[model samples]
Target: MLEVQPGLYFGGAAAVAEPDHLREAGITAVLTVDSEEPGVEDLWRLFVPALDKPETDLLSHLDRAVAFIGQARAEGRAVLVHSHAGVSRSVAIITAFLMKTDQLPFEKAYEKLQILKPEAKMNEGFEWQLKLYQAMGYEVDTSSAIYKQYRLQKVTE
Candidate 1:
């Protein structure tokens, strides 16, 4: 598990499923990027499910996920964002959240995520939206690996 911020973490299914790990980290809220009701008792679980493929309403789901994360923050609780693999969907959500939390551009936020979780990835459409959020803004390289990979995944789906 990678600590994305003071009270925010990015991790995969295995770490999330481990009660001790969560307890050890003081994570009280869990947002499964695309799905779960965790077995852990007393844990606040919010499943903001969304499709990985294109046409997936990433912005819509991200709104709810961010809202849930903000709620946890307002209550002074820690949040752990997870998904099936923790690399793609979960990473995508955290990238956007980190942008808001750190007040950084999308590319910078994405770079932070990449450094923390080397495998983190965002879909092409989600990538496009984040670019829109950047204050200074950057020219998104659609031909870049992340875009094309997700774009290909988008169309193939």
Candidate 2:
């Protein structure tokens, strides 16, 4: 796992499956954005069932994931955010958190994440969603025309 920020680690499912390493890294909370269950105990775990697909509506889960990471940070507990390959889904969520908390635009947030985790890269659809989130002022607005049209496009595909 790579420490993308202080107390926030990012990587693949391999790290999540190993509780010993998690404890060594002082990780008290885990965010699994993958299909398999890590099943580690004694830690706050949030499982977001997702695939590394452009069609996955991962934007819908951003707020909740960000909140969970923020809460863990507030409690001074380390958090690990992971996906199957540690490339797309988890990267998208972490980028969203950085964009909201640091008041950064999509490109800036993504750039910062890449610096922290060199392998960090989000998918094409996720990249678009991040830009949309930036346009919405870092918050999801389902009622907005942009969001409605985005959802419509997704459904039609």
Candidate 3:
């Protein structure tokens, strides 16, 4: 696990699954962005159950994930965000979180995350979704033109 921020961590499935790693890092909350659960019930967990596919609807879950991360912050607990490879899905979520909490635009938010986690890079579809999130003022606006277009694309895909 890598500490991108003071109480925020970014890592892969392996690190999240290891109890010792989490214990040593004092991570009390685990945000799993993959389809499989980490099965570490002792810690506070939020299972996103998403595939790493580019067309996956990660944008819609941004608010929930960000809120969950904020909850951990409010309680003064360390939180770990992770996906299967610790690259795309997890990176996407963290990017959204940073954009909302840090008041950064999509490019800057993603660039910040990239600098911290050099291996971090979301797929093309996710990348575009982040842009949409930014365009909507860091929230998913279902009635927005961009979102409607995006939904159409998803349906056609």
Candidate 4:
């Protein structure tokens, strides 16, 4: 893992330029939130059920992601969220985290994510997903919250 920022970490399947270097530098945990990567199945062999579905709803995935962040926050651990492209899923997860914890608006939360990583892009099916949420009776604002969160947390380009 690499200590890209103080209390922030990044990692991938291959050995990074500085492995264990981040641990020595005081980074606590490597936040591996990248759902689009190939080899992650090996890393999360026990949790294949969760990793198998990359295109699931932001809320379903957020439950796990937020739990990780919450644990890290409680333990004073820093995290680095990395994926294949490191844009789309990361942005969506981060947006959900902020909205759930900070009560941030959907648009503003997305803006926050874009500011952090501008290359993130939403999948083509995201519109249908939003419609699904609306059909389920979630308020438009709430569904927008999820959509914006999804767009921001996931890696894009």
lDDT of 2 at 51: 84
Q: Write the per-residue lDDT of candidate 4 for residues 1-157, one digit (tens) a residue.
A: 3333346443444323344654464544445544432311112111112231345454445556656765776676666555444555445555555555565555565576566556655443433443333333323344465656655665564
Query: Please, what is the whole-model Cα lDDT of each candidate in the order they appear?
Result: 0.72, 0.87, 0.88, 0.48
Error of 1 at 132 (Å): 4.2
lDDT of model 2, residue 103: 87
Model 1 C-alpha lDDT versus the unseen true structure: 0.72
Q: Each candidate: how many clashes?
A: 0, 0, 0, 20
Report how far residue 113 has shifted in candidate 3, in Å.
1.4
C-alpha RMSD values across all candidates: 6.5, 1.7, 1.9, 8.3
How much is 107 displaced in model 4, in angstroms? 1.5
Of 3 and 4, the candidate ahead on lDDT is 3
**In model 3, where do residues sit more than 4 Å from their true spots?**
39-42
Q: Please say which candidate is ahead in lDDT: 1 or 4.
A: 1
Q: After superposing candidate 2 on the true structure, give the runs of residues whose Cα lies further than 4 Å from its correct spot.
A: 39-41
- Residue lDDT tens for model 2, 50-83: 8888888888788899999999999999999999
Evaluate residue 66 in candidate 1 and report its C-alpha lDDT on the 0 to 100 scale: 74
TM-score of 1: 0.75
